[PDB]
Nucleic acid binder design. Structure first.
Lengths: 92, 91, 87, 92, 91, 92
DNA sequence: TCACGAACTTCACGAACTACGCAGTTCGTTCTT
DNA sequence: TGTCACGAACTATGTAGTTCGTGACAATGACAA
């Protein structure tokens, strides 16, 4: 697929998502888009994949949808985070 | 539209490529491939993006082309890797 | 190879750029019948050598030919002439 | 296949092979190479393909072996040579 | 010139090719390779010799070609195998 | 290596020789040539290999040099001989 | 409203085939012995 | 003479890279009522 575009180079949008959620614990689709500057339609498409893959599960609180990580979607983030460490390790 | 990826949900193959050079110096498009597990085609395809941008250059020795970061490439790598540690300030 | 017994897909791509200047990839593939993938393949190469340059007009993209590319185009053309003139 | 490489920007190696044959009728493998400067191996690489499709035939004359274009060899030689002018429009 | 080799001491790669055609009538270039242990490279160069000598003829289908023995080729294939046993008549 | 050329479609020269010796046992270098369609230079070029491999050894009936199969040698024939038969079997 | 489906373009990368080196090998001439 | 060394031409095959297909994909300008 795309992946390596002039915008991303190093991190894929899905990394900006997961990470963001590791902070806000949960947030609305629109929030993510703006909060990471990634165009909305990139977010919604990627969240489907996340949902479908079981890394994210919705959480209706009011009438607004929310997206939170799952165990599997948390374990995942570690694998990629450590993988992401070994890279930024070389700079030193 | 659709999304799958196993090899890179977090990092782009381009990423894995930039760093491998920073960590080794010069390398044949072959070696790049083998040590990053990024299958050949992608390796060269991305390398050509890098050239066209000014982040790496060729080096014919005898019958073997070598690639290595440029200063512009060097600055970029460390620059982004920096912005990385930032977001990963929640580990 | 069949379609390319004499001329590379590069030729059809280069020349068609000499007589348009500005040009999208998707389009070139139409005006030369050279499969789209076979084309951006060469754009990626062209860009990598300075013979061509991208130019994302806002949201669209236009691949124009460069100074350096211009000369290469002319040069490799006489070669074709000294070759063909002898029939 | 390969075809288009840094050495062959516009012209295949077989262009030279073929042309130089219209320009000498029958030539031998070792020869086709020297007058053109393309690596001998690439030359037979093509010569074989030429025999297959039926654009050339060998001359088992005497000791050395010779190659010359054929009826359908010469025809498809000018065919391609002409529509090269079909391109050099930009050159005028 | 020196003679290393250890695969083609008795049999040229051409035999396994010619013979395999008798087993299927027609086959792709990768088909007969993987099914004769003879490198795909040497196959092409060989069918390209057979085509040139009319012992075989193509037949494009979709994204690949299939090669089939012809009639003048069948004579050859058949004849030789006879020439073979005439020699195998040492035991 | 050459191996397969117009003369050698199925069988190599290394076949017709090893066979000739499985017949008369001890043939003269020269004599192997005539008894086969093999040109002299091709024969000794293969002998020197056989010799260097221990598939063949020398011998003198007077002054001429006769060649003969050996321990390592015959096992080879009675090894390849099987491959050639396992092959043809299919089209028997 | 918000995610969704259609639409454009570029990306990932696998199959197959080519450009071309290397290491044989067929045989024909010098050359040694 | 017989064998070796040279020596001109092709075969075998591996390595890197090309064509061009398929399966994504990023960021749009509409459905979807």
């Amino acid at each position: 697929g795309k992946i390596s575009t002039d915008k991303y180079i190093f991190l894929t949008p899905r990394a900006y998502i997961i990470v963001h959620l590791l902070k806000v614990g949960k947030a609305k689709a629109s929030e993510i888009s703006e909060n990471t500057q990634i165009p909305y339609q990139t977010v919604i498409q990627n969240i489907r994949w996340l949902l479908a893959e079981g890394y994210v599960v919705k959480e209706q609180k009011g009438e607004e949808i929310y997206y939170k990580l799952t165990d599997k979607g948390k374990q995942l983030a570690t694998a990629e985070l450590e993988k992401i460490r070994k890279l930024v390790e070389v700079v030193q």
